[PDB]
Design an enzyme around this catalytic site. Structure first.
Site, PDB file in Angstrom:
ATOM      1  N   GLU A 159     -11.082  13.140   2.253  1.00 33.93           N
ATOM      2  CA  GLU A 159     -12.520  12.937   2.110  1.00 33.93           C
ATOM      3  C   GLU A 159     -13.022  11.894   3.099  1.00 33.93           C
ATOM      4  O   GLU A 159     -14.083  12.066   3.710  1.00 33.93           O
ATOM      5  CB  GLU A 159     -12.854  12.516   0.678  1.00 33.93           C
ATOM      6  N   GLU A 197     -16.346  14.911  -7.338  1.00 31.66           N
ATOM      7  CA  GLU A 197     -17.774  14.727  -7.569  1.00 31.66           C
ATOM      8  C   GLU A 197     -18.546  15.999  -7.243  1.00 31.66           C
ATOM      9  O   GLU A 197     -19.535  16.325  -7.909  1.00 31.66           O
ATOM     10  CB  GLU A 197     -18.298  13.554  -6.739  1.00 31.66           C
ATOM     11  N   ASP A 238       7.133   1.346  -7.909  1.00 31.39           N
ATOM     12  CA  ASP A 238       7.547   2.274  -6.862  1.00 31.39           C
ATOM     13  C   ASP A 238       6.768   2.081  -5.567  1.00 31.39           C
ATOM     14  O   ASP A 238       6.977   2.844  -4.619  1.00 31.39           O
ATOM     15  CB  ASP A 238       7.412   3.718  -7.356  1.00 31.39           C
ATOM     16  N   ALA A 291      15.499   2.937  -3.385  1.00 27.62           N
ATOM     17  CA  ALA A 291      15.451   4.368  -3.114  1.00 27.62           C
ATOM     18  C   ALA A 291      16.847   4.984  -3.074  1.00 27.62           C
ATOM     19  O   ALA A 291      17.046   6.102  -3.560  1.00 27.62           O
ATOM     20  CB  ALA A 291      14.713   4.630  -1.802  1.00 27.62           C
ATOM     21  N   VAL A 292      17.826   4.274  -2.506  1.00 29.50           N
ATOM     22  CA  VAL A 292      19.176   4.824  -2.407  1.00 29.50           C
ATOM     23  C   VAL A 292      19.903   4.812  -3.749  1.00 29.50           C
ATOM     24  O   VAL A 292      20.864   5.571  -3.928  1.00 29.50           O
ATOM     25  CB  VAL A 292      19.993   4.079  -1.332  1.00 29.50           C
ATOM     26  N   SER A 293      19.459   3.998  -4.708  1.00 28.02           N
ATOM     27  CA  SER A 293      20.068   4.034  -6.034  1.00 28.02           C
ATOM     28  C   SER A 293      19.767   5.351  -6.739  1.00 28.02           C
ATOM     29  O   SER A 293      20.629   5.902  -7.433  1.00 28.02           O
ATOM     30  CB  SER A 293      19.580   2.856  -6.875  1.00 28.02           C
ATOM     31  N   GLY A 337      19.022   8.152  -5.068  1.00 25.59           N
ATOM     32  CA  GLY A 337      19.396   9.244  -4.199  1.00 25.59           C
ATOM     33  C   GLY A 337      18.261   9.793  -3.365  1.00 25.59           C
ATOM     34  O   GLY A 337      18.447  10.812  -2.691  1.00 25.59           O
ATOM     35  N   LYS A 338      17.083   9.166  -3.414  1.00 24.25           N
ATOM     36  CA  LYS A 338      15.980   9.576  -2.551  1.00 24.25           C
ATOM     37  C   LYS A 338      16.298   9.290  -1.090  1.00 24.25           C
ATOM     38  O   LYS A 338      16.003  10.104  -0.208  1.00 24.25           O
ATOM     39  CB  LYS A 338      14.701   8.855  -2.973  1.00 24.25           C
TER      40      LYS A 338
END
Ligand SMILES: NC(=O)c1ccc[n+]([C@@H]2O[C@H](COP(=O)([O-])OP(=O)(O)OC[C@H]3O[C@@H](n4cnc5c(N)ncnc54)[C@H](O)[C@@H]3O)[C@@H](O)[C@H]2O)c1
Ligand SMILES: NC(=O)c1ccc[n+]([C@@H]2O[C@H](COP(=O)([O-])OP(=O)(O)OC[C@H]3O[C@@H](n4cnc5c(N)ncnc54)[C@H](O)[C@@H]3O)[C@@H](O)[C@H]2O)c1
Ligand SMILES: NC(=O)c1ccc[n+]([C@@H]2O[C@H](COP(=O)([O-])OP(=O)(O)OC[C@H]3O[C@@H](n4cnc5c(N)ncnc54)[C@H](O)[C@@H]3O)[C@@H](O)[C@H]2O)c1
Ligand SMILES: NC(=O)c1ccc[n+]([C@@H]2O[C@H](COP(=O)([O-])OP(=O)(O)OC[C@H]3O[C@@H](n4cnc5c(N)ncnc54)[C@H](O)[C@@H]3O)[C@@H](O)[C@H]2O)c1
Ligand code: NA
Lengths: 384, 318, 369, 320
Positions: A122, A260, A334, A342-344, A346-347
């Site tokens: 937008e 809107e 996050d 993030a690695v915990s 697995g991302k």
């Protein structure tokens, strides 16, 4: 245990910005994090081998928060979607390639997929209809101000993003009528998903601007309202996003300025548009799962930061990542999460390399694109 | 009033310990800085949670996903159990881990934990908290069948009855009562179903629920999540005897979706973002008034800090 | 352990809520650990690797004396518990602290705020000076206001006392004795706080009666942290004294012919780094960051580290500062021991510090009484 | 006053050096905290050029941790060229500048185990490392100078070299004598040669205080008096001359910011801080709150950019 020495901008390299940014590695603190961000981005653009479990061009997941399309980052993101350098010799796209025309996922440009928050695109459209001023009631998103007129106003912006809603509503009605006359199979095909909404928007931006420029009366001649409409429509990232084929995903679209106009267009009697979110994550999480090396560069945090790394979670981790927010970790969100958080999950994968530049976007992202991205297409084009 | 006080802390030695902590929490409005904001916020929250019951007014709660990963989930459950909340607005993780923590436990850890070892040991880190992968394996056993039912229910109705996150979350709490009748008493979503409290999540697929949908769609395509009617809904609940208080613990999609669609007479911010970000999460009182999120006559107070420390002090009963 | 937050039953008592902060994640657990570490500072135990009660070094940000933390720090200087018969304390500005805290390191402008709050009242928002949503009025340097008179009598008292010792003494026994050090300056200010208020209350005209001015002066003087700090004997160190509101009076008091006062920082670093070197068990509670944090950590560096530490501030680590540093960054220098227990509570001081004082310090002095 | 639109694709034909400048030049119109950087750059650049020696003055206030980083070499270039008129920094801002002539600071990581760093003799400064041997050499350099200064103050009635300004000035002189090779890379050395007064009212808060504490345990005498530095800093910040354009560059807001802007009357100020207004401190640079307290005059031009000065300061000091 190898260690570099701390040296900052010398006497002889304060006369060239190239050597200042180069020496950012050995200055310290968070400029070294930016120096990594330069390098990891350069790796994301380098043709590499498949995932450490035949060279590929990594697929780049870029993530942008909404308000950044108000500032100059819209110009840099537009560059990422505009320039198209072809693949060299012996390199495949990292993702091997598979009315309401859906979003094509064949990206011929520098980045390959773009996730944004609600109210983002937008801002892009309303920045070709108006001009943002720095510090019809005026809105504020920090240092910047813009004008937000009524939903049914005669503002150029209000006209553009009602003809957009009307075009979508009539196109959804056509697809609903065609599947009404056909026998039941079975998917809900008349539901438009945010990727298609922004894709068909970028397709229509030209004609919608030419139409809205006339309905507002700013220019009375068609042949130069058609020319001015395309010129305004070539400034949005939606145009280059649709043209080169980078999908614009947005699970938070329901929380944008579009709503809107969606709701007010439904206050006349016709039903609201019907969105679908399962089609977006299916395309996004499959674009990531099918890839063989993935890059990740997110601007800010929030829905957008978690959505791209969740897409790479289906892939047992992403290979490269550059996070550019000013969020802090103590709240355990996050947005302020470290690259380690993030690695915990697995991302982000275990055999990775990433960096987080704890500073605001407008300082660093223009430097990122102009130091490697424009330089890396100058390398691939001038040499030959 | 309007002046910094002076509390004889030594006078607390004779009074009871419980009353001593309360006597200081009661002097917070005139202690100074971002504790005054806590004291002003507590008076708004307390008087709202008491008056806004069944006398014509409304209290609406907006919380972020990480706050229910913490212990506040049980505090929120008390609010919905007593029918003090009128509407709930979370991102997407505020529904997931609320149902998850009936199928398992979240554990406390530390930010310093090695994330590579946590991955190899199947431990997902949420700041200084840990969610074992077994919790999501059970959620796959709980949620995938519910989507299987919703897919049939949508198809038999041709996508007219169960399309929005509101109805989905409401039946999630209903399914939690049927499948797990014992542990459902501690779930916020369960009481929002039983006491009829709508939960709104416009970015529904951003989280574990979307991944469960991704697995389900990869075999049976057809499910639809239509979040635009929830906006007409949330607006209809905010359109004004008529005193609408909004408690926003943590900003993001909770804050914008609530204050953009609901016209509140009283708002309470508990955030950590800084104005330099130029984003919504940086709860700027005057800037939010400029964008129509707050009316210029709306009573508002903003506390800067981690809601994990603020929210219990604001919700502590009188 | 499992993550559990304020239940149905235990939302009716603040004790159980503050107790359950341990099982609530994020910064409530850090605050619950701050609760415990403060109680460990108060528990008599054996010296670092013959029981002792730890000597507590507390450092405070300057502006924090403008807010309600001035009330709690005053409590830390006022109430005192006699040491048990079988425990020994780890052993001009004196160091004999019979109180909860034993050393007070404050930033420039802190005690100036402490003085100024018994003269007038600090106002809140919804020429006058700002520091957040709080507002105070700093009148002219040579004004008739009560705060200006108190600070002028102080500077005049210090200048006259400095000249006397200068005229008195006009190798190893050759020290610049007429130099006044920040710890001695605020110490003498606490002693004189009674008489300085009684004299300023008359010179301003608010109370011309000598009797009422004597009684009201003591009432305003007893409210300052300087009074109880001097009465119970905690030294108030401040190497950043040279950057406070007090310098506005010290400088222009020299514009009338008399030389400026003569400060000394070597005496302060000696007394501070010696109270830490000769200590056997030490605690550290730092409100905010900046000069106060580094000065306390650097003092304990002479004791190859401190044992307990609690950092209450709202600073970040990415800027690589000694204000936003993690508790870990302290042990690398040796300012914090290896056999230590510490925690940092990332939150505004005014939210977390009252809870700490009321939940452990007020409760500990009631358990022992 | 309006956000621009830059054709990044147009940068592909222009030179790479000019391309990076085409964006940094457009920073005032990018938005958010790049506009404040661009405005700060225009103030700093014009001040570093016009205010060299024409009735104008430029005063630099930096925090101690920023000369632990590489910015000390950049700061040295400023005082080497006599562009700075005065320096305000906390004790560490003086220490590690002299230290990094007696050794090297190394780049590390915030994630390094601080317990292992202690057992390996490494002092961590954020993501930087200072070996203990650096301070062992600093003791060899500084404790003789303290004995020189004690004899100098003792036989002079404790009133010739008592302030940090004279001490820091003689630190640069002693660094010229002892180590004539590496002294060219230190900010304090050029502040001695170019006659630039350095102010550090909190002098004993750092390694210098430890060296003084070790020396004063046996020879009780050496003293410091920082109150004349206030009169001195005020003397240099007095624009009754009315032909003074005096700019204050504050990179990192701590004791430097307050101590400089309180005693110096600046016509132009640049903030490069990170603190947030919620702290309610004299570091969270609040423009209008500083004006209310007399730190900023109501007619003063001032801009605040929010971010790590390690990233901001090079782009501000980058000569065009
Ligand atoms: N057009 C609108 O009305 C509008 C505008 C913005 C956001 N929103 C809504 O608010 C929701 C969440 O807001 P959001 O996603 O825009 O961000 P956010 O408010 O959720 O915060 C995201 C985090 O990323 C960081 N961040 C954000 N902006 C940054 C910046 N410019 N530079 C550096 N770091 C930055 C911050 O740490 C922040 O806490 C969205 O879903 C959206 O729907 C609506
Ligand atoms: N955190 C999870 O476990 C989780 C789980 C599932 C899905 N998700 C997804 O991740 C996305 C982002 O989640 P989000 O809703 O937390 O937005 P967010 O994490 O981006 O919010 C960041 C901003 O909210 C504020 N904030 C954050 N934590 C706070 C706290 N503890 N106290 C006070 N204020 C705080 C701050 O201003 C911060 O800048 C969402 O779209 C959600 O769907 C998250
Ligand atoms: N009356 C006066 O003249 C006056 C008053 C205040 C400060 N000062 C001067 O400003 C200089 C710097 O001030 P400082 O020593 O207080 O450090 P600072 O103001 O520069 O900031 C210290 C750090 O501690 C944290 N902090 C500060 N105040 C906090 C709070 N209320 N709550 C939570 N965290 C907080 C912040 O993260 C900050 O980064 C001082 O040395 C002093 O000379 C003068
Ligand atoms: N760790 C170190 O760097 C170090 C080294 C030697 C001595 N010291 C001593 O620690 C004491 C306090 O240090 P200080 O006053 O010089 O600064 P500081 O550590 O107290 O920083 C406090 C404030 O300065 C600002 N700041 C800090 N780092 C910044 C950055 N990288 N970018 C932008 N802004 C920043 C922030 O607003 C912060 O709130 C000093 O007296 C000094 O003598 C520190
Ligand atoms: Na906006």
């Amino acid at each position: 245990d190898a260690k570099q020495v701390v040296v900052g901008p010398n006497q002889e390299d304060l006369h060239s910005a190239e050597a200042v940014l180069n020496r950012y590695s050995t200055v310290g603190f968070q400029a070294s994090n930016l120096a990594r961000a330069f390098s990891i981005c350069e790796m994301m653009l380098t043709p590499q081998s498949p995932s450490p479990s035949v060279m590929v061009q990594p697929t780049l997941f870029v993530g942008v928060t909404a308000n950044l399309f108000g500032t100059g980052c819209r110009e840099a993101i537009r560059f990422l979607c505009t320039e198209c350098v072809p693949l060299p010799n012996g390199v495949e796209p990292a993702t091997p390639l598979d009315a309401l025309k859906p979003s094509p996922c064949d990206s011929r440009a520098l980045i390959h997929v773009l996730v944004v928050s609600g109210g983002a695109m937008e801002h892009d459209i309303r920045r070709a209809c108006e001009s943002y001023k720095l510090s019809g009631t005026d809105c504020h998103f920090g240092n910047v101000r813009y004008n937000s007129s009524g939903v049914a106003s005669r503002n150029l912006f209000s006209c553009v993003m009602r003809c957009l809603v009307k075009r979508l509503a009539e196109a959804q009605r056509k697809e609903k009528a065609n599947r009404e006359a056909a026998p039941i199979p079975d998917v809900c095909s008349w539901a438009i998903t945010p990727s298609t909404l922004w894709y068909m928007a970028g397709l229509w931006m030209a004609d919608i601007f030419t139409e809205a420029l006339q309905e507002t009366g700013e220019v009375t001649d068609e042949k130069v309202a058609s020319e001015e409409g395309l010129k305004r429509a070539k400034s949005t990232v939606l145009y280059w996003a649709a043209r080169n084929g980078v999908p614009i995903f947005s699970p938070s679209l329901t929380d944008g300025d579009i709503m809107e106009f969606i709701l007010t267009a439904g206050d006349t009697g016709v039903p609201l548009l019907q969105l679908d979110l399962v089609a977006d994550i299916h395309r996004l999480n499959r674009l990531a799962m099918r890839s063989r090396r993935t890059g990740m560069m997110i601007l800010g945090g929030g829905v957008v930061k978690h959505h791209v790394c969740n897409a790479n979670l289906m892939r047992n981790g992403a290979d490269y990542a550059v996070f550019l927010n000013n969020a802090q970790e103590f709240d355990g969100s996050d947005a302020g999460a470290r690259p380690g958080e993030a690695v915990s999950w697995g991302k982000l994968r275990l055999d990775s390399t990433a960096v987080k530049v704890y500073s605001e976007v407008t300082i660093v992202f223009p430097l990122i694109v102009v130091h490697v991205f424009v330089a890396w297409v100058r390398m691939m084009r001038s040499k030959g | 009033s309007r002046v910094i006080g002076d509390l004889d802390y030594s006078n607390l030695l004779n009074i009871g310990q419980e009353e001593a902590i309360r006597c200081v929490l009661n002097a917070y409005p005139n202690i100074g800085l971002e504790a005054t904001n806590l004291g002003r916020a507590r008076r708004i929250v307390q008087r709202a949670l008491n008056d806004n019951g069944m006398d014509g007014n409304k209290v609406m709660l907006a919380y972020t996903s990480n706050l229910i990963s913490s212990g506040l989930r049980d505090t929120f459950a008390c609010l919905a159990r007593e029918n003090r909340i009128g509407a709930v607005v979370t991102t997407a993780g505020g529904v997931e881990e609320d149902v998850i923590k009936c199928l398992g436990d979240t554990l406390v850890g530390d930010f310093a934990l090695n994330d590579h070892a946590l991955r190899n040991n199947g431990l997902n880190r949420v700041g200084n908290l840990l969610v074992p992968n077994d919790n999501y394996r059970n959620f796959e056993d709980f949620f995938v069948p519910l989507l299987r039912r919703l897919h049939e229910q949508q198809r038999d109705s041709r996508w007219t009855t169960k399309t929005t996150p509101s109805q989905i979350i409401a039946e999630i709490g209903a399914a939690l009562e049927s499948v797990r009748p014992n542990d459902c008493g501690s779930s916020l979503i369960y009481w929002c179903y039983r006491n009829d409290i709508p939960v709104f999540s416009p970015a529904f697929t951003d989280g574990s629920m979307g991944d469960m949908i991704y697995f389900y769609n990869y075999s049976r395509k057809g499910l639809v999540v239509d979040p635009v009617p929830d906006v007409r809904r949330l607006r209809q609940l905010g359109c004004k005897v008529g005193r609408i208080t909004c408690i926003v613990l943590g900003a993001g999609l909770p804050k914008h979706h609530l204050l953009r669609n609901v016209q509140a007479d009283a708002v309470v911010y508990v955030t950590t973002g800084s104005d330099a970000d130029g984003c919504e999460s940086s709860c700027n009182v005057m800037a939010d008034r400029a964008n129509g999120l707050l009316s210029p006559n709306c009573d508002v107070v903003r506390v800067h800090g981690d809601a994990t420390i603020i929210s219990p002090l604001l919700l502590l009963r009188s």
